[PDB]
Design an enzyme around this catalytic site. Sequence first.
Site, PDB file in Angstrom:
ATOM      1  N   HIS A 115     -11.779  69.315  67.615  1.00 43.62           N
ATOM      2  CA  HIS A 115     -12.846  69.627  66.675  1.00 43.62           C
ATOM      3  C   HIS A 115     -12.377  70.580  65.570  1.00 43.62           C
ATOM      4  O   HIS A 115     -12.818  70.430  64.421  1.00 43.62           O
ATOM      5  CB  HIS A 115     -14.033  70.269  67.338  1.00 43.62           C
ATOM      6  CG  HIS A 115     -14.951  69.299  67.978  1.00 43.62           C
ATOM      7  ND1 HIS A 115     -15.730  68.430  67.252  1.00 43.62           N
ATOM      8  CD2 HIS A 115     -15.226  69.065  69.286  1.00 43.62           C
ATOM      9  CE1 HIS A 115     -16.432  67.688  68.090  1.00 43.62           C
ATOM     10  NE2 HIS A 115     -16.136  68.050  69.324  1.00 43.62           N
ATOM     11  N   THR A 161     -19.931  63.426  74.548  1.00 41.05           N
ATOM     12  CA  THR A 161     -19.485  63.890  75.854  1.00 41.05           C
ATOM     13  C   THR A 161     -20.484  63.614  76.997  1.00 41.05           C
ATOM     14  O   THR A 161     -20.143  62.976  78.025  1.00 41.05           O
ATOM     15  CB  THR A 161     -19.040  65.391  75.771  1.00 41.05           C
ATOM     16  OG1 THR A 161     -17.851  65.491  74.947  1.00 41.05           O
ATOM     17  CG2 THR A 161     -18.676  65.885  77.140  1.00 41.05           C
TER      18      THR A 161
END
EC number: 3.1.4.39
Length: 804
Positions: free
Chosen positions: A265, A159
Site C-alpha cells: 500500500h 482482504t
Amino acid sequence: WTATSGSCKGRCFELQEVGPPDCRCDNLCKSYSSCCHDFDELCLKTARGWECTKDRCGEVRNEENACHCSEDCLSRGDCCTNYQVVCKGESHWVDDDCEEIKVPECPAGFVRPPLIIFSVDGFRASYMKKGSKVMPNIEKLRSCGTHAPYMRPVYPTKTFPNLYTLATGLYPESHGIVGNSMYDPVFDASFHLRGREKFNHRWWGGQPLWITATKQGVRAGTFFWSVSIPHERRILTILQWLSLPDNERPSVYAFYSEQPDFSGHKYGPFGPEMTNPLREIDKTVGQLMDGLKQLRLHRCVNVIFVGDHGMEDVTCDRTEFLSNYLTNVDDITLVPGTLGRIRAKSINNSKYDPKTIIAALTCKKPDQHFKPYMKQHLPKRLHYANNRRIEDIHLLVDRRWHVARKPLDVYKKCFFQGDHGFDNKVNSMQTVFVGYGPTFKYRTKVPPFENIELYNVMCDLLGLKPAPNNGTHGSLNHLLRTNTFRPTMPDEVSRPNYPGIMYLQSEFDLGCTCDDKVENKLEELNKRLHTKGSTKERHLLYGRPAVLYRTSYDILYHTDFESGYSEIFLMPLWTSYTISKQAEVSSIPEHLTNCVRPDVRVSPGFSQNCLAYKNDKQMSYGFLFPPYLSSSPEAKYDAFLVTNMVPMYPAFKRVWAYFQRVLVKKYASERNGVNVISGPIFDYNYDGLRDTEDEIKQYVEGSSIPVPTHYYSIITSCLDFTQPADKCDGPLSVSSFILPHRPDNDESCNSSEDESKWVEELMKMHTARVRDIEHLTGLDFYRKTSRSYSEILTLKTYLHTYES
Ligand SMILES: *[C@@H]1O[C@H](CO)[C@@H](O[C@@H]2O[C@H](CO)[C@@H](O[C@@H]3O[C@H](CO[C@H]4O[C@H](CO)[C@@H](O)[C@H](O[C@H]5O[C@H](CO)[C@@H](O)[C@H](O)[C@@H]5O[C@H]5O[C@H](CO)[C@@H](O)[C@H](O)[C@@H]5O)[C@@H]4O)[C@@H](O)[C@H](O[C@H]4O[C@H](CO)[C@@H](O)[C@H](O)[C@@H]4O[C@H]4O[C@H](CO)[C@@H](O)[C@H](O)[C@@H]4O)[C@@H]3O)[C@H](O)[C@H]2NC(C)=O)[C@H](O)[C@H]1NC(C)=O
Ligand SMILES: Cc1nnn(Cc2cc(C(F)(F)F)ccc2CCC(=O)N2CCC(CSc3ccc(S(N)(=O)=O)cc3F)CC2)n1
Ligand SMILES: [Ca+2]
Ligand SMILES: [Cl-]
Ligand SMILES: [K+]
Ligand code: NA
Ligand SMILES: [Zn+2]
C-alpha cells in the site's frame, strides 16, 4: 467489562475461548482489550530473541527466554526453530534436496496428516517469479509441491471478503462479507475494519473450516492472530500446539501475515522497499519448516501457501470525483476507493432517484475511469448482487484508479502508492497457491483456479464433509495424490419427449408469415432422416444436456442444429450446433427477412406467436441457431421455425447479430471448428440461480412469452486445435459468456459505432464459467464425453479471462 485480574499462568494461547467477565489468554485477546494482566509477561516473551547461538546450546533452562536451546526443549515443544541447526549440526529444511513424499511419515499417535495454512495478505501472483531470488523457502515449496501459476480471488479483491471466502468456499454475497465496509439496513448496523461491530457473529454467514472441523470431531487451532503478536511467536505457538498430547492436539492450523500488503500500500507492488517484506515472509516460512523438521513433521504436514489478493499501482492523482458528475452530490453516501457503492444519504428522501444518478454517471467524460451499474447488471461472473448489504448502485473502477465523492475526501481523511479491490479478472489482483505435503502431488503444475474451490480441498485433506458451498467438489482432484472425492454426475430429473409431425399448418393462428411455398424422393427421405436425428452426432458432440428440475420439454432435431424446447417457457432451453472451420456464412435472403414458420411437431398452444411481437413496441425477436450459418438454402428454412425464436430487444439484436454473423465463424476459423450451445437465462431476483415461472417479472406484451434477463453461449473445441472440434480424441477447450439482455447499450460507450468496435469487448466483459450457466439454467452439460468426470468438472470451472 473484563475482570483483568485473573492470570494466564499455564493458559498461554489457550484454545477454548472463555466468557466475560473472565480474562482471556487466547490469540485474539489483545484485539478485544481483554487479556489477563500478565499476558505480555507470560505469553509474549521476547528475551534473547528467536534464534539459538552456539553459546546457548545445552544452556540451563531459563523460562524467561522467548524460545529455548536447552536439552529438554524438544520434549517441552519450545525450542527456537533453529535449535537443531545450531546445536546438533542439522541442515535447514531449505538446504535439503527435495524428495518425493509418497506416504505420510508421521510420529506415532498422529491419526491424520495435519494441515497448516500459511496465508499472506497482498501477495500478488507475479511475486513468485519476480521475487524468487530472495524467497528460497517459498520457492522450494513451490517447485517441490503442487502450484498454480496464479489463483483467482473473488470480487471485491479486498482482504476480509477473500479470507472469509477461503475459509467457507462461499461467494461474498452468500457469506455476507461483501466488503471491508458495510451497512446492513435490517440490522441497522455498520461494519468497519476499525472497532467492535465486526466481532459480532451476525455479520459472518456460512460455516468456516475451523467450525466444520470442530463439528465433525477434528480439532482446530484458532486461525486469527492479533496484530501485535509477532510472526515469530505465531509460528512458535503453532509448533507448541503440535507438541500437545494426541487427544488435545489440533489437526488444522492457520498462520497469517499482514505483509506484503502493508508495505505494498505504501510503496506500490514493485517498489524497492518490497524486497525486504518478501525476504521476511520467506524467513518465517523457513522457521516453520525448520520447526516442523525438528518435530519430525516435515514429511507429515500438508502446508498450503496462499494469498488473499494482489496489489496494483494506484496514486491519489488518479481519483475520479463524483462531484465532477452529479449536482446533488450531498444527497448520496459513497463507499469509495477501488470500487464504488452508492446509496441515498437519508431514507426519508423520496426525491432520491437511482435512475437519474446512473444517467449522470454514464459515459459522461471521454476517458471516464469507472462504469456505473445497477448491481443486477454487473457481469454474472462476479456473483456480486444477492445481498442486502450490496448497494443497488455500483461503480466498477478501472485498474490503477480510485473513485471518491469530493476532493476534500482525499486530502482531509499523496500517501499511498498501492491498492487492490478491482475486478477479479485483473492480472494485478491475482494471487498465489502452493500445496506441499504427502497428500499433494509432487513437482506438479496445475492450471489457475478460483479461491472458492479451496474449502472443499481443505475438507478433503482433513477427512471432513464440506458444508454446502460454491466450489465444485472434484474440480481440484488433480491437485491431490490421494483423498480425492469421487463425484458422480447428477441424475437427470426430466426426460424429454421426442415429438413427430402432429399438427397441420392450418391449426396454427400465430400471425406469422413466410414466403416458403416451394415443393423429390431422393431428398424427401433425407429431410425425414434429419428430423429423426440422423445428423445429431455432428451437432450434439457431448451428449444432450440433462435437465435437473421438473419440467416438460421436447427434443427437436434439424439438419444443422438440435434443441431442447420448453413447453413451459415456449422457447428452447438450449440449442446445440457445430460449425466447422470450412463452413460458410450467408445472408438472410430478402424474401425471408420476416419469415417465421409454424413447427408441426409442437402444438399451437405451446408455441410463440408473431402477433405479440408486432403489438409489443419495445420487444423484437431473434433466433438461437443463426440463419447465417445454415448449411444449405433448404436447411435455412429450419432456422425460421417459431421454435427457434426468442424475444430480443432491438438494442440487444445488434449484439446478437454480430456474434452470430461474424464471431461464430471467426471462432470456428481460429479454433478449427466450434460446437456452440446457446440459450436463454431468467434471473429476475439476481441470485445466480434458475428462476421458476412464478419469478418472471416481464413477458412479451399480451402473452405468456417470458423475457430472458440474459442469453448464454458455450463454445467448445479441441484443446489440440490440429483436430477439428467434431473429431477430437483428447481434452476440450471452452469459452462461454452470459450477456445481459438489455434494452439499451448504455454499458458500451462506443455503441453508436460499428459493432466491430464494441461488441466483442462487451462479450469479453461478460465471460463466464460453464458452471455459472449451469446454476442459472438447471442444466448439466458434457454428460457424454471420452473424458474423466474430474477433468470435466475442471473444464466447467474454467474462465476465459482475456488478459495478456
Ligand atoms: C453458493 O452456495 C450457497 C450455499 O449452498 C448457496 O446459498 C444457499 O442457497 C439456497 C437457495 O437460495 C438457500 O436455501 C434457503 O435457505 C433458507 C434457510 O436459510 C437459513 O439457514 C441456513 C442453514 O444453516 C443458513 O445457511 C442461511 O444463511 C443465510 O442467511 C443468514 C442471515 O439470515 C446469513 O448469515 C448468511 O450469510 C446467509 O445469507 C445469504 O443467503 C440468504 C438466503 O438464506 C440470502 O437472503 C442473503 O442475501 C445471503 O445471500 C439461513 O440462516 C430456507 O428457509 C429457504 O426455504 C424457502 O424456499 C423454499 C423453496 O423450495 C420454500 O419451499 C420454503 O417454504 C422457504 O420459503 C419461505 O420463506 C420465504 C423467504 O422469506 C418466503 O418468501 C416464503 O413465502 C416462505 O415462507 C431455502 O432453502 C441457502 O440458505 C443459501 N445458503 C447460504 C449459506 O447462503 C448459493 O445459492 C450458491 N450460489 C450460487 C451462485 O450457486
Ligand atoms: C477476515 C477473515 N476471514 N477468515 N479469517 C480467518 C483466517 C482465514 C484464513 C484462511 F484459511 F481461510 F485462509 C487464514 C487466516 C485467517 C486469519 C486472518 C487473521 O488473523 N486476520 C488478522 C486478525 C483479524 C481480526 S478481525 C476479526 C476477528 C474475529 C472475528 S469473529 N468474532 O470471529 O467474527 C471478527 C473479526 F472481524 C482478521 C484477519 N479472517
Ligand atoms: Ca434466480
Ligand atoms: Cl469495501
Ligand atoms: K415489436
Ligand atoms: Na452506448
Ligand atoms: Zn490491502
